[PDB]
Amino acid sequence: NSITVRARGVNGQESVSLQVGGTTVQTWTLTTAMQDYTASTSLTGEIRVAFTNDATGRDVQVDYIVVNGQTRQAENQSVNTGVWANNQCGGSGNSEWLHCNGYISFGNV
C-alpha cells in the first residue's frame, strides 16, 4: 500500500505523521516548498496526516495524498482538526491547512 503525501510548511520546521489505522507509518519534517513524501504499509484502515509540533510561526499545508495511484485532495476531506476556521482550531473541514495541531482524515486505504 503506497501512500504519497504532497505537503509544505510555512517555516520548514513543521513535522507531520502519516498514520494508518492508528499506527504511525512515517514522520517527516517539511520544507517551505510543496514536495512529495512517500511511504508504504501492509496495513489497512483510516489514513490520517497529522501536524504535531505547532509553535509560534509553524503551519502545514497538505495539497493532496496519492494512495495506490489514486489522488485524494486534502480540501475534499471532511475531517480536518487543525485548520483555523470560524475563529477556532479545527473550525471546519475541507481545507488544505493545518494551522493548529491536528490532522486531516483521508478515509480508509
Ligand X SMILES: OC[C@H]1O[C@@H](O[C@@H]2[C@H](O)[C@@H](O)[C@H](O)O[C@@H]2CO)[C@H](O)[C@@H](O)[C@H]1O
Which residues are documented as binding site for Ca(2+)? 54, 58-59, 63, 73, 75, 96, 99
Instruction: List the one residue from 15, 84, 93, 94 that touches ligand X (CB under 6 A).
Output: 84
14 binds ligand X (CB under 6 A): no
The reply on whether position 13 binds ligand X by CB under 6 A is no
Other CB atoms within 10 A of residue 29 CB: 12
One-letter amino acid of 45: G
The burial of 84, by beta-carbon neighbours within 10 Å (0-12 exposed, 13-18 middle, 19 or more buried), is given as middle
- Sign of the alpha-carbon torsion through 69, 47, 44, 15: positive
* Residue 84 partner contact from Ca ion, ligand X, none using kind-dependent CB cut-offs of 5 to 8 Å: ligand X
Contact footprint for Ca ion (CB under 5 A): 54, 59, 63-64, 73, 99
